[model samples]
Target: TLELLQAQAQNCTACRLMEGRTRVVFGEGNPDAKLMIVGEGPGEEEDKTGRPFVGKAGQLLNRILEAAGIPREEVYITNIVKCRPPQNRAPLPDEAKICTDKWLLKQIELIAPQIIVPLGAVAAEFFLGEKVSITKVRGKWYEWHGIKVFPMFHPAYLLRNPSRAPGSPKHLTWLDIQEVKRALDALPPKER
Candidate 1:
């Protein structure tokens, strides 16, 4: 149950960000889903509501998912670090280092998703076990942990930069979304 999961996550002190956090935004959506979406960390609205996606970035993400014809309830959503970083800046390396070991990998092991879509640079960097420039690499498909890992630009970035040249982030993302849809459609019905 979510209550039990929340309880477990609240007691986590794997990282320093937990020290001043109001609540641990563990994750939401289907616990047994085939697709898992991971974000970087909680932000102001997410921190306040103890939810993964909220505010402008999340709102834009919702539209993107909807446009892709992905059912929100059919996927699990989470973050690399469950707590919010100070001032909503990027999470410190140590913060993710601790949380990934303590929380992120463990949760992924439990969910056992077949596909993973990491939203933006931070998620891509952490999951891929290296630093990648999202601008140059977003919308590319890769594999990690035996799961299909698709990288996409952060909705927040898209919000800030709505239009793009033919090969720009936004354009690439449009291509990325279609590829994701194609992949999902090709999957066996039960698998999907």
Candidate 2:
């Protein structure tokens, strides 16, 4: 049932977001993905296309994954909230309450990826169950729902920062992606 769940997410009206959104923005990749990627929610491009991470940020992420030797198609990609918030605002914690309770939580249970990579502070906070700063936590490991969690700076941040200087967001993300690759390569072989 990922298809059944996808339909449900498409038709969802539990939150006020449906009215403003053109699409539910259910993301893509393997259901059997060993790596699961999480972003906060849809941005304008994703909202229009009904896909996640298809914008500038998405492009950067794709190249990063390529450099890390991670196949993009081998990982599941989704937003914590399926809807794009008004004016491209990130969803609030309270806004997340219902989405996770119904759609997101069950979605992950079905896929059950071996590791989760949250692409920014917001997604990291949701998984970690507290406030956090990506600058402090990037490349470190944690666990939630018995799944390994890795935090990284959003590609959007790199779009803005653009600095490749050591300790820059982009530089740190470069380092973090390597850690991600090592952790993934080291995981026990996934069940067939």
Off by over 4 Å in 1: 1-5, 164-168, 188-192
Best by TM-score: 2
What TM-score would every model get versus the actual structure?
Answer: 0.90, 0.96
Worst 10 residues of 2 by lDDT: 92-101
Candidate 1 lDDT score at position 189? 36
Cα-based lDDT at residue 140, candidate 2 = 91
The candidate 1 region of ten consecutive residues with least summed lDDT is 183-192
Query: Alpha-carbon error at 76 in model 2, in Å?
Result: 0.1
> What is candidate 1's lDDT per residue for 24-60, written digit by digit as tens?
8999888777788998888888998989888788887
Model 2 residue 129 CA deviation in Å = 1.0
